[PDB]
Design a protein around this ligand. Sequence first.
Ligand SMILES: Nc1ccc2c(c1)c(-c1ccccc1)[n+](CCCCCc1cn(CCNc3c4c(nc5ccccc35)CCCC4)nn1)c1cc(N)ccc21
Ligand SMILES: Nc1ccc2c(c1)c(-c1ccccc1)[n+](CCCCCc1cn(CCNc3c4c(nc5ccccc35)CCCC4)nn1)c1cc(N)ccc21
Ligand SMILES: *[C@@H]1O[C@H](CO)[C@@H](O)[C@H](O)[C@H]1NC(C)=O
Ligand SMILES: *[C@@H]1O[C@H](CO)[C@@H](O)[C@H](O)[C@H]1NC(C)=O
Ligand SMILES: *[C@@H]1O[C@H](CO)[C@@H](O)[C@H](O)[C@H]1NC(C)=O
Ligand SMILES: *[C@@H]1O[C@H](CO)[C@@H](O)[C@H](O)[C@H]1NC(C)=O
Lengths: 534, 538
Amino acid sequence: EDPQLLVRVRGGQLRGIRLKAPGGPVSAFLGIPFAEPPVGSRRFMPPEPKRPWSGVLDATTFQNVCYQYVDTLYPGFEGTEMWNPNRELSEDCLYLNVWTPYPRPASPTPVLIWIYGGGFYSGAASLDVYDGRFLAQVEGAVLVSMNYRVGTFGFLALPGSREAPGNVGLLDQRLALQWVQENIAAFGGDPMSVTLFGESAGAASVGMHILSLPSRSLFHRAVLQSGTPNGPWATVSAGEARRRATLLARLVGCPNDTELIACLRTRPAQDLVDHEWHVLPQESIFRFSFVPVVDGDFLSDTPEALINTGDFQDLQVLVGVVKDEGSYFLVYGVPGFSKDNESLISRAQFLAGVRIGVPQASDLAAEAVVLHYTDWLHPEDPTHLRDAMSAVVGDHNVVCPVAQLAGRLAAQGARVYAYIFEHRASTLTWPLWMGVPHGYEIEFIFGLPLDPSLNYTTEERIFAQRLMKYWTNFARTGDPNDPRDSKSPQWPPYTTAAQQYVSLNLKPLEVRRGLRAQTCAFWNRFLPKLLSAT
Amino acid sequence: EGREDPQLLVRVRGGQLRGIRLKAPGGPVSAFLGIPFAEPPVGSRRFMPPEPKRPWSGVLDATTFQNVCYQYVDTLYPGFEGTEMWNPNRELSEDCLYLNVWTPYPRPASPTPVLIWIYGGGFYSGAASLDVYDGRFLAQVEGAVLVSMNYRVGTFGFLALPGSREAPGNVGLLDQRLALQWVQENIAAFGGDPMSVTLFGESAGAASVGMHILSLPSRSLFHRAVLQSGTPNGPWATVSAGEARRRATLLARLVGCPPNDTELIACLRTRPAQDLVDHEWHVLPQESIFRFSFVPVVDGDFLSDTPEALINTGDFQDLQVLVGVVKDEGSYFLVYGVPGFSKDNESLISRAQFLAGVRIGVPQASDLAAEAVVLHYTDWLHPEDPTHLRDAMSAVVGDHNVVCPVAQLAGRLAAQGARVYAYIFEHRASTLTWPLWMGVPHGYEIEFIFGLPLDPSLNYTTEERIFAQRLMKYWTNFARTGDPNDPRDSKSPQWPPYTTAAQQYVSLNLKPLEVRRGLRAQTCAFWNRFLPKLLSAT
Ligand SMILES: Nc1ccc2c(c1)c(-c1ccccc1)[n+](CCCCCc1cn(CCNc3c4c(nc5ccccc35)CCCC4)nn1)c1cc(N)ccc21
Ligand SMILES: Nc1ccc2c(c1)c(-c1ccccc1)[n+](CCCCCc1cn(CCNc3c4c(nc5ccccc35)CCCC4)nn1)c1cc(N)ccc21
Ligand SMILES: *[C@@H]1O[C@H](CO)[C@@H](O)[C@H](O)[C@H]1NC(C)=O
Ligand SMILES: *[C@@H]1O[C@H](CO)[C@@H](O)[C@H](O)[C@H]1NC(C)=O
Ligand SMILES: *[C@@H]1O[C@H](CO)[C@@H](O)[C@H](O)[C@H]1NC(C)=O
Ligand SMILES: *[C@@H]1O[C@H](CO)[C@@H](O)[C@H](O)[C@H]1NC(C)=O
């Protein structure tokens, strides 16, 4: 036996695996149970801490992926399959992973906790792009990722009930955060320096931990990559969650909350998944059926209310977006869009797309979107219309909620750093029109280009190394700038006055001002006044 | 006669005229000033359509400018050239229906294209006798026959009680039409081609030119048109029959006239001209800028429907139009009503002053519509910057009232068969006395088109004299051929026609022609497509 692979955590002993990273070994502890399997009577219920075990628990393999819908849009295509589960689907999925340097850090090391995305309906901490071996090896970081319940299983709520209260997927995350406080020092991690980081629904989850007091004592810093707690898709009202749960219950033949939930618990997992998509109020894109609910418990008020009134004085936040946030969403529901053609659309297809892309918009509000995004010099140009459609979806759902979050946190005492990731991976198999799509920065931050077998360019390996340094410098100090590098250009904090952000690309840092300032003034200030007054 | 200069004796349908040999920088010109074209619209004739001038006996002396139509005299900045250059330069009288004619000296042997000037001044002011409307340069240098007429302004020209016989409205436009009919009958007596008449005007003059395009009985009296910083469509050029009835009834009330239309109009006719002027400004529905009390009315007669309806449905196939704007259309309007603005300070305003200004600048806007304007014109990087706010305020007024109505007109005419040429005049006169922040204000291209820099006594630069010469060539080539380009000078940048596809227009400045695309395309999509929908719905 290897003493570097033997760890005693409060629940008992574990045996990890020595893994080979490009520059040397790492110790990986995969499939650690952090909760009692949320099966049977415990379906839809908050997680319970995992009971202690006997002997040495084998923590050398990733555990099951939470029950979720498997994407079959483009079957066998690397572009879609890379996001699809890579372990067996099971309701017994509440396990976490830990990567540490080999040997175990001599002094307490800053901890980075990854919370995956997938619209709160999908994802796993076991996907290749979330591999913590590089950050652990190269930057000496203790990296943790956990599985949390997604879909009906994690977010089906009958608000006010005790059996299905909602937000249980976020409670699974909170329990993995409590686990880290209690056990990370056994791995050489500093429980007093925990940075949460996530992308898309993961970033929204990070934001929801900022906005929920019981989570606030479990971390010190936060990274929100292409996602926010505020916005059109991250939350639903208690009413809308009640509507959706009652409809899915009807669809699966379930005729009192206790009675309804009891019946939902008798249904096989796949039956719930099979009907999940049928509860959305309109034909839409960037909208998910079971997402966090504004319950007045985990979320005391709507994220908008909480970000506008919160005190963020002793907080550091790294936020940002990718060049083309909304591009991939178009092939999943907008007529005229495909990965296999240049997707040059007509004006009619653009107006049609805006109603799907902004499903909550009135006729006047949709006209306001169309008139803002049209290039009145080339209003019929298919390339301009195709690119405008991507912008509507990315701006509405990601860029402008990020700009609003950065603005409110900065105004209310937080230390904020903002970025725009603009490098398209050389290895990308999605069409060129999709640009830098939502989620394709993750592989750089995690340092995948550093594996020569993955065939990224030399420039991409240097760029990934740079990104890993920003993220780990941020986790260490709350500032992404290298205290060693006495050379320019420094990454300035984002402020309400100067609105500074940086470009993350192959070229050195470039400081820009105003994150789509005019367009986001449209989404964040005008459009609410339009759906408000009428 | 017999001892007189034979080149100054001309007969017209009404009788004999004696003109005057004027001096232009490059030689003499013939001028026939103060020719009567109508029966004085006085007494019982006040508010009534003009009647053609009855013939006279003897030789009428046409050597001096005649009376300016009764109007409000501006006393904003008294003594200041900037305001006094626009103020009447002859006696104010209700007897003002006279026209002027400048022709080469000696008069052309062959029929010459005719240019007819229609002055601006919000339909409340103006005269064809102002120094900037001097036809002596265009006549001398370009051999043109230039005509300008006085038309009734204010209550006198545009007070209407729609449906009445006594005050039908648009009589100021009928005075213009009568001067157009006079040109058809008599211009050949001066060497002018009645078959090649180009109307040109600025501001309310340009709106009047547009109203002659949109009114069938005028269409047979001209062949081409120039609309400088003004249009028939837009927020200020017309009023509804209801709004005109409201305003006429209110002014009647204000001057002690109890409201029957016959009875009310009869009383208005007994009131001294100055009493009507003294109360003219008191009938505007809101605190506003770029809004005038008595303007053309959509009567279902001179204007068969609203100018918007007429420009959207009209066939403009055999029509050549030259349109354009100045760099800073709305700047001067700010000192005439927006708190925080003065010609005497740099006018750096606050956000509160900007929001306040938008309500004055867009008086017909709802709370939501005004918010849409504020959010569009704010620089979300520097939303408190006084220079940006001052400049945004000028842009709101200029765009709303001039730039975007011009863009809409150019678009509709081009789409419906017309040959449109569009420009942006960007040269600030070296002689300008308004502050630098005002840029190139509304009306300050006129002196260049008329060729005033050509007079050495006016102290313009050599570059400005070459530039004026260039402009006079564009306008007169346009009047001659319907194309501002010189077919001889093929090297010089070509002025392309404005089309709906390419949206081309040129920069008129000291530098050679530069072709640009889209006349403030995004912002005007806001004013012309969005904001009306913010009235059709909420
Ligand atoms: N079977 C069924 C029945 C009914 C419906 C649907 C499916 C679907 C649907 C869902 C998923 C895949 C394909 C189709 N939608 C479409 C809505 C979901 C599309 C949004 C979406 C799809 N995905 C795929 C997840 N994988 C990705 C993820 C990321 N990046 C990616 C980049 C490229 C491609 C995939 C990526 C970053 C974060 C991790 C997840 N992520 N978000 C509906 C919308 C309605 N209005 C009504 C009914 C249905
Ligand atoms: N006595 C009194 C009583 C009440 C009111 C007013 C006056 C005035 C007012 C009118 C003229 C000068 C000073 C003040 N306005 C303001 C009217 C705004 C008119 C804007 C305007 C002013 N002028 C002057 C005409 N001369 C000019 C002309 C042009 N350019 C110019 C450039 C700079 C300066 C003058 C120019 C283009 C050519 C035609 C005339 N032309 N348009 C009101 C607006 C209300 N809402 C209500 C009440 C009043
Ligand atoms: C792209 O392909 C899909 C079918 O594969 C089709 O519906 C769509 O019209 C195509 N677009 C173009 C531009 O041909
Ligand atoms: C890298 O390229 C080589 C061919 O040069 C190929 O054999 C290998 O499988 C590639 N790997 C990936 C992951 O693309
Ligand atoms: C300009 O002067 C006027 C009064 O003459 C005043 O109302 C305005 O506030 C002043 N503006 C500035 C910028 O000083
Ligand atoms: C022109 O300049 C002279 C000074 O050389 C001056 O006396 C005269 O008043 C000026 N006239 C005008 C119109 O500016």
